[model samples]
Target: KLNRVVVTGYGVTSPIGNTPEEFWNSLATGKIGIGGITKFDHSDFDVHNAAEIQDFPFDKYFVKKDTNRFDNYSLYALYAAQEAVNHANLDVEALNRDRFGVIVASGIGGIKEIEDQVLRLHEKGPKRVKPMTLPKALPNMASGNVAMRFGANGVCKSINTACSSSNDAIGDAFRSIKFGFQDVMLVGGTEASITPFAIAGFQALTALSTTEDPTRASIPFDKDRNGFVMGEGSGMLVLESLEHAEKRGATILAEVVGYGNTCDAYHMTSPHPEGQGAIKAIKLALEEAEISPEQVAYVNAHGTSTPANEKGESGAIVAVLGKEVPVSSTKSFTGHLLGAAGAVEAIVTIEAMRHNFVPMTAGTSEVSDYIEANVVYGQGLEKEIPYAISNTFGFGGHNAVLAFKRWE
Candidate 1:
């Protein structure tokens, strides 16, 4: 018998909102979280906008000593996992620790830590570098720390595919539960790369928006979209086998019906011009779920606002799902979350299914004339969404898509 996977709970720390309630409210209200870059002196660079987290109460989650030892990415991962477990009301002590697992991800883990440590190494010498810097800087630490915190001994790992990181992690976790390798998994991604060095790095590639207006920057699928605005955050979900969740009397958020992971192998940083890879990936997901294109109610596009991305991805989505199903990019509000984009978008997709609402692409007045896709804008629409897809395409041309079915 094939086991089924269900989402028990989720937690998100986004620039638009720290909690799911806050994130969803902002999404529905057409609120944009982006503003002038405040993490560092970004005035020197052409990148000016970012969706930086605001007013996160660190004292509530971490002791003073621990805060100093961990990097911002780790903190975001740890907090998101904590909130996910709490949201699920899961009793780790009551479960079989061997069967509990975690697969969290980050595109650029501990980048801020590396920058700080490198500066310390140059200015104050190698000996001055903190001993914990190595551990904190490792990309795997996000999953390692989350596993250690929750005593999840099974399959603790991080899958880094840049923007598709979290969606890939979720896809892998779904396989683990469905294949009977694990009973429960904490899966998602985190990113906190809003620093001077990161900003300069992305700006060098001309991938980031130089737009001064917060609303204008990160406008995916719109005619005026120039580039993506940098954003930082984390999102985590508690995924459990339907049997396990039912046995524990857990509330089911949505069913993880199918998932697809594909590679464009076309370009290092650009999507396949005609979306061949994304098309294949979406088809794979739909095939896995045995869901047809006409059944899909909505899509969360990997609309990064890049000229290449907005056209290719939306085109791919419409090619597969047709033009009737509405598509939106939440990145318009939260900017680009890098590693965490897919996870937060996954949570948003689930919310849309539960709420029967299709959120509009914030700040996008009109879809580009070149793209033939149903890009929803203006205001959110109240529409019944029985099934939806959350799409994420990373820097490496990795295409990951998740198919979700309404639990009710």
Candidate 2:
């Protein structure tokens, strides 16, 4: 039988906050988490600010001996996955392990590990590289590790859709439960690319903000906006079949009603100027939700603070949901978390519906005149969001939209 998908639990380790409660608090207060880059020596690079997870207690989860075994992305993914499992009050040993699955992703997975090991190989020799380098550096390692950690024995997978990596993973996991392939799934994204190589690489494309001032570095839709501030973090959610959740007496947080995954087929790095693909994607999401454009109350936009990306995305929002629907970008507060960005924003959307509120584009002062969408900025707003959508567009012309409905 076909099943309905519902979110039972979620976890976040982000620049703004590490827990869901803290994340929501920061979001509601319009907190901007971008700050001076501390993960690496970025003095020579034009990019000076990033959204690094502050004071992360890595030792809390792993012992000293195992600390260097897993890469940063896997560490984040597993951490958030454990949080999600605990939040759901799951008894893994009691469940049908074969029916559980994991789908986690990272756009540039194990990049820091790769950079380090590559340097070691060049300076010393191939023998100097860590023996577990391949296992730690693969893009699929995070998902594989999460599956192993939780004993989720079905459909462990990962995808690299650039910035939209996590959202696509979520979308697929939702499908897996909805179609009866899996009863439960842990899905999200992680990234640890705040290292020097990543910063220099992204700055080469002028895709990262060059400004050192945290406040101005990642201001989405602001007239003075430059580019996205690189961010490192992870966000995970526990998705289960509604029947399974009901049978287990689990608290249903929200329903995943629809997902739209489409390609622009127009540009590699730039969004379609007219937002043709994005418009279709949102329309598709609304179509699957069996709702009209007017029913959507808010949008968690893929507002990356880039001149071209935000303008095109804002126009797409106007074209599909209209200008009056309240819209904002959590990225302004968290910076762009790269591959893991969408999951964090999705968690933000779920919390927004639960709280009946809309977060502002935290760092933005003046909305760009070229953008016509109702870009909420400066201050948060109190509003009822019965239906909401989260947009996450990747670098390879991939546009994915997820439609969520409030659980009554």
Candidate 3:
């Protein structure tokens, strides 16, 4: 039998906020989190700005024993997972552990650990490198550690679709429940790759903003926009079969009615010039949700504050949802979280629907003439959002879209 899936709880650790409430507040008020890099010594690098998590209290979430075995990305996953489980009021000890699962994702998992270990090897030989490096640095460690932490034994998996990683993970988990493969899934994405290597590497590609001004560094859809600012964080959500959530007396936040994924098959780093893949994905999601384009109240666009990305996403939205549909990109405030971008923005979409408002694209005062969509700017506009779509497009032409219905 096919099952209906719904989101029951969510947790986030972002540059703007560390929790769901905090995240919503930042989005609603147009708080900017992008600033000068503080994670590492980037004084010599051309890229100076980022959305690094400031003053993160690692001790509050993980002990030394936990830190010794896991990478920061995995730690972020577990931390957000804990909050999601708690928010769902899930009693793991009382539930069927075998029926619960986790599907967390990362685009460049444990790059920080890998960078550190490789440097040690070069400087002090193989013996100096830690033995746990491989396990800790693997891309799947986030999902693996989350499963171990919560004792989930059903269909645990990890996804790595670049910037679309978390959205893909969440989509896969949604399918698992819909197909009766699992009842509950802890799903999201975590990214902590704001390191010297990541920054320098992206800088070489000219994909990073060189602007020193925090306010203008990550502006999306603006004429003067340059590129995305590096961001590091995690966002996790608790998804369950609607039947299972109701049986457990869980409060349903929203209905995960549809998901769509496609690949451009055109570029290694750039999106399809015409956004063919993005259009397909968006339409597929709406089809799956049995929702018409006109029913969608808002779109959380994958506006990376880049020239090509904004233009392509705008064309895609216009092709599918028309130009008059309200749209905004939260990355203008939180910066680009890479793999975690989709999940964090999905939470923002849910909050917008719940609060009856659409957040402005912070940092973007004017939309470029090339953009045809109705991109919200300045203060947020109050509106009833009964349905919404969140878009995430990754580096390898991966495009994923999720459709959500406000639960009344």
Candidate 4:
């Protein structure tokens, strides 16, 4: 068996809240983060609202000189990575540079930048476009920028598995450290794709909520749920091997005991109808963790509040955990963050375990009779949370599961 991997520190910036503290408080109070569309005029589209990270100070995290070089998505990733590094207080100068690494991910690199420059190029000319546009908007720059910032000399890679992007990034980081490929990794995901093209693309596929009511807008598994509400932000974590953590006297939050990943190859826009692909991923995670399905205390489902995904994932959980585990969709709180969803959800999951609470499925008002998992609705609840699983299924049939244990 490979060595154990533990999460030493975490950081997040989500629509629900900015810091991890604020995010957890929102969960505890069952605070809804939804609001009207302010980034761009949504009057042109049928879906007029979403959850957005409001009033984030980019200058506070980065200096004025370097801020213009990266896209907002990459900036979010870098911002969260800095927070995680600070949280872990890792002495980067002291650690062996060759044994450190970074892995970050995103579905869309920088939608705002892309959209803005495309207009400039089309309207004015190629010469009118900004020089930093391409680098900032590249999908891999999310990890590349972070690696450059921290000088993490070990293996560095970025993943873009649609919605499951961040989970795969984190899973790869954990496995790298577990198999002795690296001693530590800065892992996370970021996205700022709440732009016209992104929204229009999703809207074209009928993948977003058209409901006008903020409270009812993003309801997952609810009778009135129309579709997912777009969300934006980032979540980052510092993962260190158990031995390295001990050697450095780091404060470990929890151990990532298992990871599962699979692809359905069934479709490019939706999950498999039978949910067999998700089942394989969850089972693989459980097997890697060496735990029974009954042992999963809670599940962070990829409950996007869409008609197809909500029911598909619900059945998948029931098939595996047999109705015992309580499942909730924090996306009800954060909306569907696309590439950044998995990372923020992972941080939320760990925080949920740390605080002895099972975060609520904020917008899910009803449970299907056929669904077997104990789906919590409305506000978050207090519980003796010990172990939990976080899942994310992407558009191109990618399914990933990460099982975590609360540090004793």
Query: What TM-score, over all chains together, does every model reach?
Result: 0.99, 0.98, 0.99, 0.97
In order of lDDT, best first, we have: 3, 1, 2, 4
- Give the poorly placed runs of model 4, Cα more than 4 Å off: none
* lDDT tens digits, residue span 287-369, model 1: 99998999999999889999999778877987888778899999988889999898899999999999899999988887878
At residue 272, candidate 4 shows an lDDT of 91
Clashing pairs in 1: none
Please give the TM-score that candidate 4 achieves against the real structure. Answer: 0.97
| lDDT by residue (tens digit), candidate 4, 1-408 | 567898988788888777778888988888878888898887889988889888675776777777588777887887788888888988888989899999888898887888999998999998899998988888887788888888899998889899999999999998999999999999988888888899999999998899998888888777667889999999999998999999988998989988999999998988898699999999999899899987888899898888888778988998988876778898888988888888898988899888878888886777666566778886666777788899999898999999988898
Give the worst 10-residue stretch by lDDT in candidate 1.
38-47
Each candidate: what lDDT? 0.90, 0.89, 0.91, 0.86
Residues forming the 10-long window of minimal summed lDDT in candidate 4: 363-372
Clashing residue pairs in candidate 4 are none
Clashing pairs in 3: none
